[PDB]
RNA sequence: UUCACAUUGCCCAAGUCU
RNA sequence: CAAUGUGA
């Protein structure tokens, strides 16, 4: 299956709230615009170089062509004009000299009708013509692509009149995201602010000082320590410098000592260029070809402007970045608004050429604030908790189903001197108190409590515990902060022996709080098979009247700059009618592949376990799929919808449950703000939990909505977006929106509505745990990685990822 | 490794020419 | 999840 279903209706549930979105309405003319194909030889040039080439070409060849007209260009092969050029489908070949000569061919390809775009935005046309949207994108990006430094769909520039140094030769550049989007109303310009790290365009000498912590360079006047030379080398290698060259290495010898087949560097610069070095003690930059011999003294070189820093920031740099860029929701809103008035898109000569107007104020949108579900607890009292502003508490409440803990052990890997037996005893007493209150009685002292040190001690201790203590339910593992012992505990517990473990940092043992201990109990109960709470059964949407399984799926990709690590696919599935308990599946797969390769096998496993747990076969499968961008919807849907079907088909016998396939995107560039100040919640001033938007700024024909399910603590809340790619079950907007919100209240690790539904959230936890199982380990290769993430038989059916 | 929220890191995007 | 903040 392929085509996403149309929006069935609009939601009606919940009180209204006035909102503003960072979407700016566009007025687009109803005219044909003209699309030309460009070919530039040689063709290996950076996109920015191509834009320059075309810019000169446009100025140079005006009299024959382009005379009044201002073309826009995508930096590759696509040029657009507001009026036609004098051409046929007949190519015209031009020569361009750039202060290098280029051969450029211009060939007519098509007319883009903006009239058709209007119709498609309206009801009239069934589909949105991508190519037309792409053309508008090229118009809006034309000038900023050359005026600023493009990064993704954003643009960055050095800030005028201020500096935000990060140290280490790095600094903060502020910028904005920009994208053109169709909507139920008009075309929209989506604008958000952002910031990212760039290298300071400074003398290399200054760069050296920042990297090596020299106040000034004169200290010392010796050549560098190899370690100093190595550290500097790590930082500058790959960066571009100008006198433009990319640095490929730093010499071991100083410019004075360093020679090449042609004498010394220093002497060459004395002789040929009549320059004498201030600092001939320092090494040279080797630039250009690694196997060649071009060397530049540090003193003659500048880091060239506008190079983004790709490397991870240090902890101090990160701290500085956070402080420089953190903003409340109202402050974020004002910054976007100020940016829009300053950007003045309507005096952009290219936007102007195409007769486009952009509104300078945020679009007004009405939201609805859904009512939260009630949360049912257990014990005698069977207390009901009522969320308010996205939060509830467990005070005077007991777990729906609490586990009695009879046999448990403590392993303390923190040093006895810092985490004493008194600490452990007091922590134990306080934990037992909180746990009894929660209906998860820890009915005695641990059966075993020992200090250990180092990763080598984990496996023999755990094997001893498993072999010795019949009925052992839990090992509480105390850690001295960040340590490789954690990953070893999870390797052994989750994958080697299949034993429940709960780690706790030493600092939270030495000094306990009731809220931390309570939260800890949330995880312990779940890990041991308990049910913390359930949605009030009678408050659930009607989908629950028949057996239904809820799946959450995510792929997590390796960090920036990584070239060989696998991506990790995780799928979880509900295992009861509440829905509360989940089981997990996980796979390693191709580097940076978003499509879940082995999804059919994963879903089959989950369906089998669902039937084993409930003795029902689902009549419906609700699949929440995290993190797929719009440009991947069709490709992902095609493989993954078919994989779900395949799993069903292979199980049985005309078993064809209805599938609802929903993409959840937490990371996108849509922000919503309270119009009225009295609606702003808390210090951060965000929209309230439950705020739902399915009008105005959403898709013109398809079934999508924003739901900000969580209370915003800090900064500006990201309202999660939900796009229904497939729906056999024919949900109404209301039912699916309410279902989705209720699922955000079923996440076991906290008494709060979280920002995405529990199944999607668990899928993330599963993928992250697999990554932990793979630390320093990432056909024969694939099998090794696959073995590493496979949990023990006894762990298979548990919520070990909690 | 108590937990959520937020920033970055993740598919698409972006980027790579003496 | 890691780094860094804001909170419970
Ligand atoms: Mg993902
Ligand atoms: Mg790409
Ligand atoms: Mg953190």
């Amino acid at each position: 299956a392929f085509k996403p279903p149309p929006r069935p209706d609009f939601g009606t549930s919940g009180r209204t709230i006035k909102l503003q979105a960072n979407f700016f309405e566009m007025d687009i003319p109803k005219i044909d615009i003209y699309h030309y194909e460009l070919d530039i030889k040689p063709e290996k040039c950076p996109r920015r170089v191509n834009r320059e080439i075309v810019e000169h070409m446009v100025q140079h060849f005006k009299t024959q062509i382009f005379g009044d007209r201002k073309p826009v260009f995508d930096g590759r092969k696509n040029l657009y004009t507001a009026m036609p050029l004098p051409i046929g489908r007949d190519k015209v070949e031009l020569e361009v000299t750039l202060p290098r000569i280029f051969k450029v061919s211009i060939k007519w390809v098509s007319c883009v009708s903006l009239q058709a775009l209007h119709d498609a935005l309206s009801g009239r046309l069934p589909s949105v013509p991508f190519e037309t949207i792409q053309a508008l994108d090229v118009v809006m990006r034309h000038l900023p692509s050359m005026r600023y430094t493009p990064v993704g769909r954003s643009f960055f520039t050095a800030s005028e009149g201020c500096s935000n140094p990060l140290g280490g030769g790095r600094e903060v550049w502020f910028g904005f995201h920009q994208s053109v989007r169709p909507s139920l109303w008009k075309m929209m310009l989506n604008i958000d602010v952002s910031a990212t790290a760039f290298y300071k365009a400074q003398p290399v000498i200054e760069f050296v000082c920042e990297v090596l912590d020299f106040k000034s360079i004169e200290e010392q006047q010796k050549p560098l320590t190899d370690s100093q030379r190595v550290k500097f080398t790590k930082e500058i290698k790959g960066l571009k410098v100008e006198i433009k060259y990319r640095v490929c290495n730093v010499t071991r010898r100083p410019a004075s000592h360093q020679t090449f087949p042609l004498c010394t560097v220093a002497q060459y610069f004395k002789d040929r260029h009549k320059l004498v070095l201030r600092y001939p003690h320092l090494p040279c930059l080797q630039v250009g070809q690694e196997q060649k011999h071009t060397y530049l003294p540090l003193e003659v070189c500048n880091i060239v402007a506008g190079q983004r820093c790709i490397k991870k920031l240090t902890d101090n740099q990160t701290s500085t970045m956070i402080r420089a860029t953190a903003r409340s929701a109202p402050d974020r809103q004002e910054e976007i608004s100020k940016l829009m008035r300053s950007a003045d898109f309507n005096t952009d000569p290219y936007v102007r050429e195409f007769g486009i107007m952009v509104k300078d104020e945020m679009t007004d949108v009405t939201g609805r604030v859904l009512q939260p579900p009630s949360i049912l607890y257990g014990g005698r009292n069977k207390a009901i908790a009522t969320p308010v502003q996205g939060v509830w508490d467990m005070r005077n409440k007991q777990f729906h189903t609490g586990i009695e803990i009879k046999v448990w052990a403590i392993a303390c890997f923190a040093p006895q001197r810092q985490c004493t037996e008194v600490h452990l005893k007091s922590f134990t007493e306080q934990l037992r108190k909180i746990s009894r209150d929660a209906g998860m009685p820890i009915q005695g002292q641990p059966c075993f409590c020992k200090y250990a040190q180092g990763a080598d001690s984990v496996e023999p201790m755990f094997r001893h515990l498993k072999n010795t203590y019949a009925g052992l339910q839990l090992v509480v593992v105390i850690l001295p902060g960040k340590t490789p012992v954690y990953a070893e505990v999870k390797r052994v517990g989750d994958t080697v022996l299949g034993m429940a473990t709960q780690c706790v940092q030493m600092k939270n043992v030495q000094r306990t709080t009731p809220q931390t201990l309570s939260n800890l109990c949330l995880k312990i109960n779940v890990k041991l098979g308990g049910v913390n709470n359930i949605l009030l059964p009678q408050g659930r949407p009607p989908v629950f009247q028949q057996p239904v399984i809820f799946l959450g799926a995510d792929v997590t990709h390796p960090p920036a700059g990584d070239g060989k690590k696998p991506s990790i696919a995780a799928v979880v599935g509900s295992m009861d009618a509440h829905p509360n308990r989940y089981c997990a599946t996980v796979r390693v797969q191709q580097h940076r592949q978003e499509i879940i390769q082995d999804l059919a096998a994963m879903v089959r496993e989950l369906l089998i376990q669902f039937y084993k747990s409930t003795r029902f076969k689902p009549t419906r499968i609700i699949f929440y799929r995290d993190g797929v961008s719009e440009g991947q919807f069709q490709q992902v849907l095609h493989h993954e919808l078919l994989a779900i079907r395949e799993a069903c088909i292979k199980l049985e016998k005309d078993y064809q449950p209805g599938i609802t396939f929903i993409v959840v995107q937490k990371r996108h560039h849509t922000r919503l703000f309270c119009t009225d100040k009295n609606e702003r919640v808390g210090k951060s001033g965000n929209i309230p939990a439950g705020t739902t938007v399915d009008t105005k700024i959403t898709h013109p024909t398809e079934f999508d909505f924003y739901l900000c399910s969580h209370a915003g603590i800090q900064g500006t809340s990201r309202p999660s977006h939900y796009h229904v790619l497939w729906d056999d079950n024919r949900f109404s907007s209301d039912e699916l929106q309410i279902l989705t919100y209720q699922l955000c209240h079923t996440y076991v690790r906290c008494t709060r509505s979280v920002s995405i539904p529990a199944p999607a959230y668990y899928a993330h936890l599963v993928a992250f745990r697999a990554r932990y199982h793979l630390v320093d380990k990432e056909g024969r290769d694939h099998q090794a990685l696959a073995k590493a993430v496979q949990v023990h038989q006894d762990t298979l059916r548990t919520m070990y990822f909690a």
Side-chain angles (χ1 to χ4, degrees):
Chain A
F2 313 83
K3 274 161 244 239
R7 196 184 303 282
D9 53 20
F10 289 102
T12 66
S13 194
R15 62 93 166 185
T16 52
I17 184 172
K18 292 184 179 188
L19 303 173
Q20 287 176 273
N22 61 340
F23 281 29
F24 299 83
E25 297 173 16
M26 305 174 62
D27 289 345
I28 303 301
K30 293 182 176 180
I31 309 166
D32 273 340
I33 61 171
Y34 302 84
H35 177 204
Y36 299 92
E37 189 171 0
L38 275 66
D39 176 39
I40 303 170
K41 294 179 180 180
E43 81 173 339
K44 294 205 294 270
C45 291
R47 197 167 183 178
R48 188 49 181 101
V49 166
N50 290 351
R51 297 187 189 276
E52 276 301 324
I53 292 172
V54 164
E55 191 198 28
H56 272 152
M57 175 190 86
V58 171
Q59 288 167 14
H60 182 290
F61 289 84
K62 186 200 306 186
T63 59
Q64 186 173 355
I65 61 171
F66 310 120
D68 289 345
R69 285 166 283 272
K70 285 160 175 141
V72 295
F73 175 56
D74 78 338
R76 290 170 184 135
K77 311 229 158 185
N78 297 286
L79 183 132
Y80 302 88
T81 67
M83 287 296 180
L85 307 167
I87 311 186
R89 181 177 65 83
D90 281 291
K91 172 178 307 160
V92 177
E93 293 177 350
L94 313 194
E95 211 158 21
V96 177
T97 65
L98 196 65
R100 295 185 181 273
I101 61 171
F102 292 89
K103 287 301 179 295
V104 191
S105 66
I106 312 162
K107 187 201 193 295
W108 169 280
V109 190
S110 74
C111 295
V112 179
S113 49
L114 299 183
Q115 178 65 64
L117 177 50
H118 286 81
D119 299 344
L121 283 187
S122 178
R124 294 183 181 277
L125 287 171
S127 196
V128 181
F130 160 88
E131 293 177 350
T132 302
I133 306 295
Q134 186 193 31
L136 287 176
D137 186 74
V138 178
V139 171
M140 304 310 292
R141 281 188 206 281
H142 185 79
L143 186 51
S145 298
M146 294 173 308
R147 176 173 308 283
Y148 304 125
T149 298
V151 174
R153 296 179 177 92
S154 297
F155 296 99
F156 291 92
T157 203
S159 51
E160 317 176 351
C162 56
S163 54
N164 292 87
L166 292 170
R170 298 158 187 193
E171 63 174 13
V172 182
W173 280 19
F174 290 98
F176 65 95
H177 161 88
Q178 173 186 290
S179 58
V180 162
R181 306 187 51 87
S183 78
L184 281 161
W185 177 223
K186 299 192 173 175
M187 290 304 305
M188 295 286 183
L189 193 68
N190 178 203
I191 302 285
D192 196 1
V193 289
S194 54
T196 191
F198 277 75
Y199 292 100
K200 297 180 182 182
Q202 61 181 343
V204 170
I205 291 301
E206 289 198 322
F207 182 77
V208 176
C209 287
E210 301 209 6
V211 175
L212 296 180
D213 214 6
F214 297 166
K215 293 179 179 179
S216 80
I217 198 194
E218 293 181 348
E219 290 180 350
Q220 185 64 60
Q221 269 146 310
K222 288 182 180 179
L224 316 158
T225 299
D226 327 308
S227 295
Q228 284 183 330
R229 187 182 70 256
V230 166
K231 173 160 190 149
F232 163 65
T233 303
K234 305 275 183 151
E235 300 290 353
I236 205 183
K237 199 181 296 179
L239 294 189
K240 294 176 306 195
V241 296
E242 67 192 336
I243 294 172
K244 299 180 308 168
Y245 307 90
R246 212 180 277 280
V247 182
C248 60
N249 215 333
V250 177
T251 62
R252 177 182 65 83
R253 300 190 286 190
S256 56
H257 297 225
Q258 173 78 39
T259 57
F260 64 107
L262 177 63
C263 72
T264 75
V265 162
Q267 284 165 349
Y268 167 65
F269 272 77
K270 307 234 287 174
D271 278 321
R272 168 55 163 76
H273 304 141
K274 296 178 175 178
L275 295 174
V276 169
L277 310 186
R278 285 231 204 251
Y279 325 85
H281 67 303
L282 314 171
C284 296
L285 299 179
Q286 189 195 345
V287 310
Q289 298 230 345
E290 288 183 352
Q291 307 90 288
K292 281 215 166 83
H293 52 85
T294 304
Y295 305 99
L296 291 170
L298 307 195
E299 186 183 352
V300 302
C301 288
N302 289 337
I303 305 291
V304 355
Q307 304 179 72
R308 175 164 65 122
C309 181
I310 285 304
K311 305 184 188 75
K312 263 164 201 151
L313 293 182
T314 67
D315 300 347
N316 293 341
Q317 287 171 341
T318 297
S319 176
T320 298
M321 175 70 74
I322 298 278
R323 275 192 314 268
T325 62
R327 295 175 197 164
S328 66
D331 286 350
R332 172 76 154 275
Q333 180 182 14
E334 184 55 28
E335 287 305 302
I336 298 172
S337 284
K338 286 177 169 166
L339 172 71
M340 279 307 279
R341 291 193 297 274
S342 164
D344 221 31
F345 281 94
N346 295 334
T347 64
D348 181 315
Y350 299 93
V351 167
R352 182 182 65 198
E353 170 84 339
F354 288 75
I356 295 165
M357 292 292 295
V358 181
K359 203 167 187 275
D360 43 18
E361 305 176 285
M362 286 191 186
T363 301
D364 297 293
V365 192
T366 304
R368 286 165 295 107
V369 186
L370 300 175
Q371 277 293 113
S374 297
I375 308 298
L376 178 61
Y377 282 88
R380 297 291 187 190
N381 58 345
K382 299 220 206 194
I384 292 176
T386 304
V388 168
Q389 294 185 324
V391 181
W392 69 99
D393 67 77
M394 249 199 96
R395 295 197 289 278
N396 280 90
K397 308 182 186 72
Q398 287 76 58
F399 293 136
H400 174 279
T401 309
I403 302 303
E404 305 203 341
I405 304 173
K406 301 159 172 309
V407 187
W408 62 295
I410 296 181
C412 185
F413 289 85
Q416 180 174 350
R417 180 169 306 168
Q418 305 175 88
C419 194
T420 74
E421 299 90 333
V422 171
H423 285 136
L424 292 174
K425 181 66 169 64
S426 178
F427 163 83
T428 292
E429 292 189 273
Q430 286 165 328
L431 180 64
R432 292 186 66 235
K433 173 186 201 174
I434 298 303
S435 78
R436 161 209 72 192
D437 291 347
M440 182 188 80
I442 298 167
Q443 288 171 331
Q445 292 298 304
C447 61
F448 171 101
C449 186
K450 297 293 175 62
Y451 289 102
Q453 195 169 307
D456 293 308
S457 65
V458 178
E459 183 168 344
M461 182 186 285
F462 282 17
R463 286 185 180 277
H464 174 259
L465 287 172
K466 189 178 178 178
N467 296 341
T468 301
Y469 300 99
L472 176 66
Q473 294 166 273
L474 181 71
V475 182
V476 174
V477 180
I478 313 308
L479 303 173
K482 189 190 218 164
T483 168
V485 173
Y486 178 84
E488 175 62 3
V489 165
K490 298 307 187 180
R491 183 185 71 90
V492 173
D494 296 341
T495 80
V496 178
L497 299 177
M499 303 166 65
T501 58
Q502 181 54 64
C503 302
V504 189
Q505 282 197 76
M506 170 179 74
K507 72 190 187 180
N508 301 319
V509 172
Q510 303 168 314
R511 177 181 69 85
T512 66
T513 66
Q515 175 73 271
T516 289
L517 292 174
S518 180
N519 284 346
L520 196 59
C521 286
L522 298 190
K523 290 158 58 83
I524 293 168
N525 199 53
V526 166
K527 280 174 170 169
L528 269 52
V531 176
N532 288 1
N533 54 60
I534 66 175
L535 297 173
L536 184 71
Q538 59 263 52
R540 297 173 298 174
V543 66
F544 286 92
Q545 293 166 1
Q546 298 174 16
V548 46
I549 186 175
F550 297 94
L551 301 186
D554 175 54
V555 177
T556 295
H557 303 293
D562 183 272
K564 278 206 82 276
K565 290 178 188 173
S567 295
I568 293 171
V571 186
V572 301
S574 63
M575 295 290 136
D576 58 41
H578 300 313
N580 177 262
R581 306 276 322 166
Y582 282 77
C583 286
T585 62
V586 68
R587 297 290 186 275
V588 300
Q589 61 175 39
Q590 174 168 306
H591 180 77
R592 301 192 193 283
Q593 176 180 317
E594 184 70 39
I595 287 172
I596 299 168
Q597 191 67 38
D598 206 23
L599 181 62
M602 297 166 89
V603 172
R604 173 188 175 90
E605 287 182 49
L606 295 170
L607 289 173
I608 292 169
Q609 187 54 45
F610 179 96
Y611 181 68
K612 179 176 177 53
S613 303
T614 72
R615 285 299 184 121
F616 283 114
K617 297 165 185 176
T619 66
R620 298 183 178 102
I621 297 176
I622 311 303
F623 188 76
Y624 283 94
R625 176 61 160 94
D626 192 294
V628 180
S629 60
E630 306 179 1
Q632 300 280 261
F633 280 178
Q634 293 304 312
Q635 187 179 5
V636 166
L637 180 69
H638 179 252
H639 184 268
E640 298 185 7
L641 180 61
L642 293 182
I644 297 162
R645 286 183 183 177
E646 180 187 346
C648 296
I649 290 315
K650 303 215 182 150
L651 276 167
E652 164 177 320
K653 174 215 289 186
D654 299 309
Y655 171 61
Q656 290 185 338
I659 300 162
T660 302
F661 196 114
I662 310 156
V663 170
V664 189
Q665 293 172 258
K666 180 183 175 65
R667 305 197 179 176
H668 48 69
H669 305 278
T670 304
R671 295 301 179 270
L672 294 163
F673 306 95
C674 295
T675 299
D676 300 329
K677 295 174 192 188
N678 60 22
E679 292 276 21
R680 295 176 181 169
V681 181
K683 177 202 190 186
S684 71
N686 281 288
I687 63 188
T691 298
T692 305
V693 170
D694 67 347
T695 60
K696 191 120 184 223
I697 60 170
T698 46
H699 199 276
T701 63
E702 296 173 2
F703 187 1
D704 72 315
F705 59 91
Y706 295 92
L707 166 61
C708 183
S709 51
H710 59 287
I713 304 308
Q714 185 271 325
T716 305
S717 295
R718 290 176 177 269
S720 292
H721 184 264
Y722 297 88
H723 204 125
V724 181
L725 295 190
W726 195 253
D727 187 18
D728 295 317
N729 297 308
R730 304 296 218 103
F731 279 93
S732 68
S733 290
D734 269 330
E735 183 171 353
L736 186 54
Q737 287 162 14
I738 291 167
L739 172 63
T740 300
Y741 193 38
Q742 291 201 12
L743 291 173
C744 297
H745 292 73
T746 64
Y747 184 73
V748 295
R749 310 211 307 184
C750 55
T751 56
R752 310 172 64 83
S753 184
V754 292
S755 63
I756 59 184
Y761 215 129
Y762 297 144
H764 291 288
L765 299 183
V766 172
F768 290 137
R769 177 58 51 78
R771 195 65 78 181
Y772 252 119
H773 291 157
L774 290 169
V775 173
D776 296 320
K777 289 182 178 173
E778 48 179 11
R780 299 189 294 271
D781 287 347
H782 173 82
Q783 294 300 320
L785 299 179
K787 290 170 183 147
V789 305
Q790 179 56 59
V791 299
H792 190 274
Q793 187 62 246
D794 288 343
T795 306
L796 270 176
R797 284 146 192 94
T798 69
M799 294 176 73
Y800 68 90
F801 50 87

